[PDB]
Structure 1
Amino acid sequence: NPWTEYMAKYDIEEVHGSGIRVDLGEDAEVAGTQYRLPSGKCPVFGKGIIIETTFLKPVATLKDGGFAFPPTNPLISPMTLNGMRDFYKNNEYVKNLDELTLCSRHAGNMNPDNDKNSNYKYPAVYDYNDKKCHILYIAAQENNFCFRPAKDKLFENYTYLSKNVVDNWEEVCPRKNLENAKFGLWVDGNCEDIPHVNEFSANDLFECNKLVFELSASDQPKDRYKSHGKGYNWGNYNRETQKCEIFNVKPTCLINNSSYIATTALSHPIEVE
């Protein structure tokens, strides 16, 4: 299989290794109590939280706040990319990280246990629009104060980042959708179609990507609950028949077809290559 190296980033179970829709693939102890927290190694492009008044607002210190960190001194959240690089200008192992990894490491730098070295590290959202890193004080992603994770037009520049986001995600994680390409399975020297797919109608690539995300790996219904990256993470979008062909086994090659755009739950809902 000549596709092995190229198709490695689409082995979401191996490169991401956790839930996508709801990421709670690890546990951390904060002073005698275990908590669930995100642990996906890949960034989730376009993911945000919909509150049934926006989740990037700071946590309430009334009764209706958001998911983000409360105001701090010095203000470490929200913090711009340049603000972060300046903050870590003496740390050569951090100051030159890509914006997503840096945001992840910045969030993971904040220890809640002020008297001991705990392993709890907050998730984060990087907004490409403002170039701002938002540390999420609340790691919860769905509760149905009801809320749910989703891909949305409002969220297209958001990126959901766990503590485990690898510094080489650009090389090993998906981002762009593959235009004129179709996910397939390599068999006997030929790339065959995915034998069984679940067809969901979708008006455009965005809605297909949204659907895949809704059906993808989830660490919370509606260990034990951990998906470990297993799920309906991939989708072949036929732009002509407007079919989002969704499946749950990893693809191992590409098929040239001008009618198709290959997408994943981790991928950006718009960007193509």
Structure 2
Amino acid sequence: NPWTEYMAKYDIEEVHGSGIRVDLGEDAEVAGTQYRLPSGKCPVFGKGIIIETFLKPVATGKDGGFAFPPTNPLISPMTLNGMRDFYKNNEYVKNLDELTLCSRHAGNMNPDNNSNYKYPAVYDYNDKKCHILYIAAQENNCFRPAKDKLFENYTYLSKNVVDNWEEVCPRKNLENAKFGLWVDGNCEDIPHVNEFSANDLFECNKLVFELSASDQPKKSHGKGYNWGNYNRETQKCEIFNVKPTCLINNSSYIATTALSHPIEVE
């Protein structure tokens, strides 16, 4: 299989290793109490929390969001330039990409009296700000995780986001391409898919996310309906839960994943 190296980033169970829709793949203790917390190794592009907004500071002392309360010095929210300046003496941190840097910055804040509880974070590409999430919960349905037009520039980050996610994690959608399974020198179609109707790529990506690996009933370890072949002509989102191992050239298709950005194509 000549697709091995290229298709490696789409082995989400391996490269992400946790829930996508709801990421709670690890447990950490704070002062003798066990808490669940995100642990996915890949960034989730376009993911936010809908409250029936969540980047607002959490209520201290209940009309607030999930983000960190004001501090001195204010470390959340913090711009990319603010973070790089804050770690200007740390060569192991100052040159990290914006997503990994946001993750390491969030994981720097220990609320314990040397535990391993590290807050999840959200990087907003719009104004280039890193928001440390004080609330690691993602669904209580009251709130729910979702991909939305309002969330297209958000990026949900766990503590385990790898510094080379650009190389090993999905981001772009593959235009004129179709996920398949490599069998005997040929790339065959996914034998069984679950067809959901979708107006565009965004809606297809939203559906895949909704059906994707979840560590909470509405640990997955990355298992789930994480992939989708979107036929832009028949407007069908073909969703499946087995990892693809090759690509089929088809101008009618766009290959998307739950981790992938809802809009960007390549």
Secondary structure of residue in 1 paired with 2:207: helix
Q: Give the deviation of 1:102 after TM superposition.
A: 0.1
TM-score of the superposed pair, with normalisation by structure 2: 1.00
Q: Give the distance between the partners of 1:181 and 1:119, measured in 2 at CA.
A: 41
Q: Give the distance between the partners of 1:32 and 1:234, measured in 2 at CA.
A: 38
Q: For 1:12-44, what per-residue CA distance to the aligned partner results, in whole angstroms no more than 9, with x for missing partners?
A: 000000000000000000010100000000000
Tell me which of 138, 141, 147 is aligned to 1:141. 138
Q: Give the deviation of 1:208 after TM superposition.
A: 0.1
TM-score of the superposed pair, with normalisation by structure 1: 0.97
Secondary structure of residue in 1 paired with 2:100: helix
Q: Give the distance between the partners of 2:21 and 2:208, measured in 1 at CA.
A: 9
Q: Give the distance between the partners of 2:121 and 2:19, measured in 1 at CA.
A: 15
Q: Give the deviation of 1:169 after TM superposition.
A: 0.1
Q: Give the deviation of 1:63 after TM superposition.
A: 1.6
Q: Give the deviation of 1:268 after TM superposition.
A: 0.1
Q: For 1:50-96, what per-residue CA distance to the aligned partner results, in whole angstroms no more than 9, with x for missing partners?
A: 000x0000000172110000000000000000000000000000000
Secondary structure of residue in 2 paired with 1:100: helix
Where structure 1 has 5 or more consecutive residues not aligned to the other structure, the ranges are none
Q: Give the deviation of 1:207 after TM superposition.
A: 0.1
- Kindly tell me the number of residue pairs found equivalent between the two proteins: 266
Q: Quickly say closer, same or farther: Cα 1:87–1:6, change in 2 above 3 A.
A: same
Q: Give the distance between the partners of 1:257 and 1:113, measured in 2 at CA.
A: 53
Structure 1 stretches of 4+ with a deviation exceeding 3 A read: none
Q: Give the distance between the partners of 1:227 and 1:138, measured in 2 at CA.
A: 21
Q: Give the distance between the partners of 1:21 and 1:202, measured in 2 at CA.
A: 19
Q: Give the deviation of 1:261 after TM superposition.
A: 0.0
Q: Give the deviation of 1:47 after TM superposition.
A: 0.1
Q: Give the deviation of 1:188 after TM superposition.
A: 0.3
Q: Give the distance between the partners of 2:32 and 2:182, measured in 1 at CA.
A: 49
Q: For 1:215-266, what per-residue CA distance to the aligned partner results, in whole angstroms no more than 9, with x for missing partners?
A: 00000001xxx00000000000000000000000000000000000000000
Secondary structure of residue in 1 paired with 2:210: helix
Q: Give the deviation of 1:132 after TM superposition.
A: 0.0
Secondary structure of residue in 1 paired with 2:228: strand
Q: Give the deviation of 1:195 after TM superposition.
A: 0.1
Where structure 2 has 5 or more consecutive residues not aligned to the other structure, the ranges are none
Secondary structure of residue in 2 paired with 1:56: coil
Give the root-mean-square deviation of aligned CA atoms. 0.5
Q: Give the distance between the partners of 1:21 and 1:221, measured in 2 at CA.
A: 11
Secondary structure of residue in 2 paired with 1:227: coil
Q: Give the deviation of 1:140 after TM superposition.
A: 0.1
Q: Give the distance between the partners of 1:62 and 1:156, measured in 2 at CA.
A: 32
Q: Give the deviation of 1:200 after TM superposition.
A: 0.1
Aligned residues: percent identity?
Answer: 100
